[model samples]
Target: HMLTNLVAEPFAKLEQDFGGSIGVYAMDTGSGATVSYRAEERFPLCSSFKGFLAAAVLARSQQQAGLLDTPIRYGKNALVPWSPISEKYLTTGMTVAELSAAAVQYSDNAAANLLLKELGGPAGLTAFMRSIGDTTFRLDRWQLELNSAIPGDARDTSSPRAVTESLQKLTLGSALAAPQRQQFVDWLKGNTTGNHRIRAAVPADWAVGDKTGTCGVYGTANDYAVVWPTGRAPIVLAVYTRAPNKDDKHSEAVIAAAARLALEGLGVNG
Candidate 1:
């Protein structure tokens, strides 16, 4: 709770700021230490869970033979109806690599579901999380199974600490093999959901790869990022907001403010 206050306290004075609960977490990946106020708390994963599914697929591919460069079809059956991409296009096909890119970069629900299915469904993803020592982390089955599921009590959850730990492993060459890690990085590079909170404080040109989640109600919106600047240390940050009037604008402003404050506190500048 101390961490929550430390990171969010700065926003207390901003009036017109819709009041809501928020959590922020950052880690100097190189140092293996948290630069956070409340980095241990769990929040709804939203689409952020796709990142985990992405990693799980890479891990599965590495362990299983004949998986590399294999063609995975992306027909209508593989698509999710509410996804932006699926809504625009009726039927399109992509390889496994391209599908991963769509899931990460575009936050495409259809792409994510396809990748999840390819990786052995929800059960496969659970096994992958366990392999990484994240026992408490679990996806909401209702959300996974029911397409019309809202962000109900089945809140897909994860802690800043657990996320940062997983990120550290990824950076240290442990979570995934070199080739797979590069693929993950490349896919992350294509992330298009940048108008959210975490990237609001960082430089536009900086290599920031992230995933964001937003809810229309319940004051829940979040952005998680892994930043790599040209010469500075790499950092991973996860910021979540649960405030009244938690629209995109409010969430973005709060995220930008908190991120700037935290980075400046650490002697780093955007």
Candidate 2:
């Protein structure tokens, strides 16, 4: 799991330039080549946890026949400040599937909370990650509240390596039934919030799906992705960052730069 100096050196420079810590893990699904730099270091989950919340919902749907289509209605109290897509349908309500899509694709706070509630709260999502063999993933608090991203706090945090591994399992491995996996990938692929992060480092022709998180504190922000290079197996990776200072800014360019290095380490075109 040691990173070649070729990759490691650049990552160190990148983090120094960004004035924060950066964690990256990339796996080429075909040859199993990998690049790891601080990949085991814990970073806040932020809004990124919604992607797994949606997957957990998909997992539950495998056994519950009408779950996805079931409608959920909530009042004004449930609508958090940043619930974009969810607020749009406040009066009309949304199905479980719709809420899941909003949570993943739009990073909707209320939608994520509603879906998390459906799964029995933060412990339920953490249990789902444990079920999928991701011991590092944890969801200890609800949205907005969980975005605190304190420098050394472990609550609602996970490592880049674990995020990439769990993502591979759900998106490409046999962790979820085939249909559920596809649905999860579809939700990620449709995500509209990651254009400036990992998606920016990928070739335009290559297919990519990603989820993004911005904690708005301690320079904490992250993106995890599934990228399909032309004529090659997909690659899954996660890049997370945090700074020692609470007011420090997270850089999308730094995330993209790290992602480009990850692809380069795997001998893949960026």
Candidate 3:
């Protein structure tokens, strides 16, 4: 059935397939590449906002390298509901670098909030958002602080284009200095999650460095990554799902399907 379907055609029909609204954007960074379908709405990013946090920390660390290695405090309070790091390590100290790793790789909520404080809270992303593209994007609440947020300020949100724009700068190294850019990519490449989504479709040897976000309350499921298929150009795939009422596993299929098609669009299989 997919034989002659255009790359965006299947994606445009995701809502029908999954029964939930979704926003997806995939871009091949070379040779006339771009793909998007219904990517214009505001979507809550959940943990996927770590991409913004990672970039924010690296950029700020360059201003004073000393801060990069500084150890931040961590403990029981750092332990948010379902994260791994806070539970395993209990109370301890982690540098800005290790904290970035924990947040990106393990999706550690405690580690994430610590890094947020180091990055200067929401102000950091707010200040740097314009440099990459837009300002409406928000890293408003720390992952650990998700539920108790003020009524209007509770959810951390961003648009498909907005998140993709930040990622675009990250890959281009425009948001971070050379060393820091490579550091950021390494953090993503080093991640251990989201392998079943965007990474599921890319070739084995290809690189799909990514971060994933899952809602604590069926809010969203997101996978944002830098997909490099050997010799081909790197493609940035940002898949955000919205299902406010229930657990939306269908969104997972939508993201993976879109990624496979995006890879095909770039002429890669196996």
Candidate 2: the clashing residue pairs are none
Q: What lDDT tens digits, residue by residue, belong to model 2 across residues 139-235?
A: 8988788989987899999999999999999999998999999999999999999999999999999989999999999999999999999999999
Q: Over 4 Å off in model 2, which ranges?
A: 2-9
In the range 190-257, model 3's lDDT, one tens digit per residue, is 88878788888777788768988876555457788887878767778787776545544435667787
Residues 186-232, candidate 1, lDDT per residue (tens digit)? 77767888665667788888887777765445566667778886686
Per-residue lDDT value at 101 in model 3: 83
lDDT score, candidate 2, position 133 = 92
Considering lDDT, which of the candidate structures 1 and 2 is the better prediction for this target? 2
RMSD of each: 3.8, 1.3, 3.9
Tell me the lDDT of candidate 3.
Answer: 0.71
User: What is the RMSD, in Å, between candidate 3 and the native fold over all Cα?
Assistant: 3.9
Q: TM-score ranking from best to worst?
A: 2, 3, 1
Consecutive 10-residue window with the lowest summed lDDT within model 1: 142-151
The segments of candidate 3 whose C-alpha lies over 4 angstroms from its true place after superposition are 1-7, 144-155, 244-250, 265-270
Model 3 residue 25 distance off true place after TM-score fit, in angstroms = 1.0
How do all the candidates rank in terms of lDDT, highest first? Answer: 2, 3, 1
Among all candidates shown, the one with the greatest lDDT: 2
Strongest candidate by TM-score: 2
Q: What RMSD value applies to candidate 2?
A: 1.3
Clashes of each: 4, 0, 0
